[PDB]
């Protein structure tokens, strides 16, 4: 009774950039309570567990924070797909989750998976309706674009800043942000294809997140809806620069606001470490 | 350029109990900034790095949280000593730290180090002087014994409860506790040789700690000073039960309050995992 694991830095091509996730293989012998205890033991923002598939996919993936199981998270699933590429020749990988089966395209160089693209759940969205409270918490007077909250498992609010330097200058009051339950606050700035983001979430137990993969799809939708890109055009989103964990996420939303057909998010991943646990 | 590491559960004899620390070997090639980045990457409460000695010890140990270096911490040094026992036959280990050289006795069974005892810095102490504020934050009316704050690197406040069940019933207001800077709050209950503890510290970035090894020595002093044990008598301190990380710490203080000669803390440790990182 031992399990091998890898630590993947997701949305990075260099170790110690991007956002880490520990991926545990051959986890079918672990009861869920033990998966939870292991995720707590590692204390990474998420640990994932690779299980035999039950509905025709390649594998079933369970995602745990140190305190609870999650239905969906982008960077942990990206890292899981990249890690599993070391163990399959498949060009595509179908990972079963609580959101259904998530399709991944694996990208390789000489047998090593260096990147992947995923099709995300199509989000829903509406106005947050707490704008002055949120802006006060962030320390700014206004957003550029409408402050809207998106749902694809987790919930993501988007607040637009007028320049990248204004984004980097943010020093939010995290106590005030803690009154925004069950959501993450994503502040963004940029133009055209290239955007910068910073994510803050007391609700999700993070002062500032390096790479919020489940926010990248919704941000592409947000930018297309508010006229900064078209549906069908990709954006490059660079997150985590200010905290020294630069993370590059690519995202594209196809269709139109009223009839979205696909939400794609991709990025590189690199192995930081590999190990074995004693149970 | 790779480094091996182990995850040791300190103050435990069973994996997933006690308090984890990652121990990185052969770290002399790592600049301190990189040690800090690695400790952040792992996100364990502490990671330690094993370096060549500079003042006649066996090794020099650097202790990092995800955000800063620490001069002293008990469970990380305990785990480091136990981990290093896999690589030496020595009965005693002298580990250089910012507090000076810390002497460890290693305890083995068939070549495996299963426990260790350390001589801790002798603490200083005084009344906290914020009793009503602290008791309000904890949700209780009074302490049994004087509320005093001890210093041996970190700072530890001790608040006594009238029964173990009263200790387990505590649900502190962690926002109110956050006004207690640069210290940990240790609540305790028990009798004779056997004590229970719970530690809370927003200042040290933990809602509730499993095993606060640097608090065990000061608690023995506290109990001897306030007449519950004698100087020279050991106590058993069980921490972390309520959070499912039961941790057993043993402590003894020799001398008298005005002239302490030794503060000893010991416990078991077990390997949870072993790995290698790519830099
Ligand atoms: C600790 C915060 O972790 C985030 C929580 C929910 C969604 C994520 C993601 O989608 O990558 C995570 N990055
Ligand atoms: C995250 C909190 O970690 C504690 C910090 C300071 C001292 C410790 C110890 O002495 O074992 C640590 N347990």
Author numbering:
A (entry chain A), B (entry chain A): 0 to 278
The authors write:
Phenazine biosynthesis protein PhzF (E.C. 5.3.3.17) is an example of an enzyme that catalyzes an unusual reaction for which substantially different mechanistic routes can be proposed. On ligand binding, the homodimeric PhzF changes its conformation to a closed state with only one water molecule remaining in the active site.
While an E45A and an E45Q mutant were found to be inactive in previous work, we tested if the glutamate could be replaced by aspartic acid. The reaction catalyzed by PhzF is rather unique and it is therefore interesting to assess if the enzyme can be used to convert substrates other than DHHA. Towards this end, we have investigated the turnover of various analogues, including ent-DHHA, the 2-hydroxy derivative (2 S,3 S)-2,3-dihydro-3-dihydroxy salicylic acid (DHHS, 18) and synthetic O-alkylated variants of DHHA (19–21). In contrast to DHHS, the O-methylated and O-ethylated compounds were turned over by PhzF, but because these molecules cannot undergo tautomerization, they eliminate ammonia to give the respective aromatic products, which may happen directly after deprotonation at C3 or after the-proton shift. The structure, refined at 1.71 Å resolution (Rwork = 15.0%; Rfree = 17.4%), reveals that the ethyl group occupies the position otherwise taken by the water molecule that our analysis predicts to be involved in the tautomerization reaction. For the tautomerization in PhzF catalysis, we propose a reaction mechanism involving a tightly bound water and E45. The active site of PhzF in the closed, ligand-bound conformation is perfectly adapted to bind DHHA and a single water molecule only. This is a prerequisite for the remarkable catalytic activity of PhzF, which combines an isomerization reaction that needs to proceed in the absence of water with a tautomerization that requires a water molecule to become feasible.
